[PDB]
Amino acid sequence: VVIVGKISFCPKDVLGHGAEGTIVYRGMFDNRDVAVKRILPECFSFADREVQLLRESDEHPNVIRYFCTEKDRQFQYIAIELCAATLQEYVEQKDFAHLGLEPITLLQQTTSGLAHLHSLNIVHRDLKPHNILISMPNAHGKIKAMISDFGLCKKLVPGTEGWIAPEMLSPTYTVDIFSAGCVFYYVISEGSHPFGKSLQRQANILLGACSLDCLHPEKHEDVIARELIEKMIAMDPQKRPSAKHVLKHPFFWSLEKQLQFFQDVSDRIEKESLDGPIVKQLERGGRAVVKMDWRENITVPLQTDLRKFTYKGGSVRDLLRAMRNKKHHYRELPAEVRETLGSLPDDFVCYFTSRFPHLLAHTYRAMELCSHERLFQPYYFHE
Ligand SMILES: Nc1ncnc2c1ncn2[C@@H]1O[C@H](COP(=O)(O)OP(=O)(O)O)[C@@H](O)[C@H]1O
Ligand SMILES: [Mg+2]
C-alpha cells in the first residue's frame, strides 16, 4: 500500500496501463476513491500552469478534475476523478447498456468541454476514445462524459497515432477539432474509424485517405453528420470549424429545432428577389436536392391540397414555403392531409427530411450568409 502524501493508492488495483510506462491505479485522494496515474517525469511533463488556470475558473462538468499532484523520487503522481470506463467501452457496449447517455449528447458534452479548454487557449493535443471517460453513476445514476489527460506533454510529436491531426506530423485548437472529428465518426459508426485500419490510419491521415462508409448518402440523419464530420477532419486546418461552431451544427439539433430552422429560413427568403445572392445560392444545389419535381415525391393527399391557392416544384425556396404553410395552417388542413404529415413537430418534419435527405444540409450551407443576423443566431455561431 504505497502512500505519497496526500495521495493514497494500493497496487494490484491497477485500472490500466498507459504509454511510456504510465500506470493508473484505483486509490483515494482524501476520503474519496480517485484514479491515481503514475508517470515518469523523464517521459511526460505535467503542466502546472495549465491545470492551475483551469482550477481558478468556473469548472466545466464535462472536463475532468485533477485533484492533487504529488512527486516522489522515481515517479510523479496525479489524481483524477475515478471513472467507470472509457469511450471505447461505451462504443463497444450494447445500446441498452448506455445507462441513459445518448451518443449525440455524449459528443455534445465532449465538444463543450473541449470548447471550455479552447476558451482558455488550452489545446488538449491528445484526444481519443481512451481520454474521453465515462463517469461513475451519481446517486440516482445519471452519467456524463469528461475529457481527460489534457495538460500532459511528452518530453523529447504529442498525441496518439491515428488521432493526430495531419499538420502536427507535417499547435493551435484545430488539432483537437481533427481528433474530435475522428471521435465523432467513431461514436456514430459504432466502432469504425474515418481511416479504417488501426496500423494504417495515421498513414492514411497524412495522405488523406479518409472514407466514411457508415453514413448513407440518402439518409437525412447521416447527411447532416457527414457534412459536419468532413469539415472537422479536413486536411487543411483553416477549414475546420471551432468547438463552438460545431455545437451550433444541425447534427445537435432536435427535430422541432430542425423544423423551426426550416420555418425561420422560409420567412427570410420571402422577402428575397429571385436571382438575388441568397436565393441564388440556395437554389444552386438542386435540381438534385429537391429531386427534380418535388411534388412527385410527396404523398398524394399533400399533392392535391397543394393544388389549391402555385408552387414551382424545382425550387427549394418553394418547397420551404410549402412546409411553412402547412405547419402554420396545420389545424385548417383536412384530416386526410394532417394524417399523412403530423404529428407536429416530429413526424411532420421527418416527412420532408426523409423524402428530401439533402434538404436540411443543403439549406444550412446556403444560409450561412445570414449567420450574423440576430434571428439565425441559434443556428450559427455569431462570433
Ligand atoms: N480516471 C480514470 N478512471 C478509470 N480508468 C482510467 C482513468 N484514466 C485512465 N484510465 C484507464 O487507464 C488506461 C490507460 O490510460 P492512460 O495512461 O491515459 O493511457 P491512454 O492514452 O491509453 O488512456 C485506459 O485504458 C483507461 O481504462
Ligand atoms: Mg488517458
Side-chain angles (χ1 to χ4, degrees), residues 1-9 11 13-25 27-30 32-48 50 52-56 58-72 74-77 79-93 95-141 143-151 154 157-169 171-196 198-212 214-217 219-268 270 272 276-277 281-286 288-295 297-306 310-311 313-320 322-330 332-335 337-338 340-364 366-373 376-381:
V1 179
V2 183
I3 299 182
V4 191
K6 312 173 182 56
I7 309 173
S8 165
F9 74 87
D13 295 30
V14 170
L15 289 158
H17 294 86
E20 321 300 345
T22 304
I23 306 183
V24 183
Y25 321 82
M28 293 178 295
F29 166 44
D30 179 79
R32 75 199 292 187
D33 298 55
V34 304
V36 182
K37 169 176 285 190
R38 185 187 72 179
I39 62 174
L40 284 166
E42 302 91 339
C43 304
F44 285 109
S45 62
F46 181 76
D48 299 304
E50 277 186 349
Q52 181 60 24
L53 170 56
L54 208 55
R55 195 184 307 165
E56 290 178 349
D58 288 19
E59 283 188 1
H60 194 283
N62 306 123
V63 178
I64 198 164
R65 281 181 296 185
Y66 294 171
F67 293 118
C68 193
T69 178
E70 300 294 352
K71 305 188 226 300
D72 76 335
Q74 283 51 55
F75 300 102
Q76 177 166 204
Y77 300 83
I80 63 188
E81 225 172 315
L82 172 57
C83 288
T86 84
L87 177 60
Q88 177 177 346
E89 287 85 342
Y90 178 106
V91 176
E92 269 163 27
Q93 268 175 17
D95 286 337
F96 53 77
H98 285 129
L99 309 186
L101 184 52
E102 286 178 337
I104 279 68
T105 85
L106 167 52
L107 298 178
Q108 189 172 341
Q109 286 170 7
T110 303
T111 308
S112 191
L114 193 70
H116 176 236
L117 299 175
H118 296 177
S119 73
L120 304 182
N121 274 126
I122 302 178
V123 185
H124 200 325
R125 283 178 294 109
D126 189 14
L127 182 62
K128 54 178 187 171
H130 279 173
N131 285 345
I132 296 170
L133 301 174
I134 307 304
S135 71
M136 275 180 174
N138 75 316
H140 314 96
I143 63 175
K144 54 169 155 179
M146 297 178 293
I147 57 176
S148 176
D149 294 25
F150 54 79
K154 181 155 58 180
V157 165
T160 303
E161 277 188 12
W163 312 95
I164 308 187
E167 63 267 22
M168 269 190 156
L169 286 176
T172 72
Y173 76 114
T174 56
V175 170
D176 299 357
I177 299 295
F178 184 87
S179 305
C182 298
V183 174
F184 269 52
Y185 182 90
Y186 179 75
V187 174
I188 289 167
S189 56
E190 295 183 348
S192 207
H193 194 267
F195 318 78
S198 181
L199 295 177
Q200 48 186 9
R201 54 185 45 172
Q202 192 56 49
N204 283 343
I205 291 170
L206 292 182
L207 61 110
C210 82
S211 167
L212 294 53
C214 303
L215 301 174
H216 198 241
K219 284 185 189 177
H220 168 257
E221 283 67 15
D222 290 351
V223 172
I224 296 295
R226 191 183 198 98
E227 189 272 353
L228 168 57
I229 294 168
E230 60 192 12
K231 284 196 172 59
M232 291 184 293
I233 61 178
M235 213 60 49
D236 174 20
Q238 292 184 130
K239 293 177 181 297
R240 294 172 203 163
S242 71
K244 299 198 172 184
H245 271 62
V246 175
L247 294 168
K248 290 289 186 184
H249 200 269
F251 172 75
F252 293 101
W253 295 356
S254 68
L255 281 172
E256 77 169 12
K257 180 169 185 176
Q258 284 179 19
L259 182 50
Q260 191 63 51
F261 176 75
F262 281 138
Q263 181 178 142
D264 284 16
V265 170
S266 188
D267 299 343
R268 183 60 166 76
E270 189 66 13
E272 282 295 339
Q281 176 72 351
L282 198 169
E283 284 297 340
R284 171 81 70 81
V289 175
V290 68
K291 299 187 174 175
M292 293 305 187
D293 191 329
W294 55 260
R295 305 164 283 170
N297 295 106
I298 54 171
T299 62
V300 182
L302 191 64
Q303 299 179 32
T304 306
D305 191 41
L306 290 166
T310 298
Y311 287 116
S315 172
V316 181
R317 175 186 181 265
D318 275 24
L319 173 54
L320 294 179
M323 291 170 56
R324 180 209 174 278
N325 199 40
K326 300 304 180 186
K327 198 245 178 302
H328 282 236
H329 296 117
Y330 182 94
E332 304 168 28
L333 308 177
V337 177
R338 306 193 302 272
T340 198
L341 286 183
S343 58
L344 304 156
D346 295 350
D347 303 339
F348 179 98
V349 74
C350 293
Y351 174 83
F352 301 102
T353 65
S354 67
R355 272 156 188 81
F356 308 95
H358 294 280
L359 177 50
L360 176 53
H362 174 62
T363 303
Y364 187 75
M367 294 299 299
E368 261 185 318
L369 315 186
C370 311
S371 78
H372 60 78
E373 305 183 21
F376 295 85
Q377 187 165 320
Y379 311 115
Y380 300 93
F381 189 67

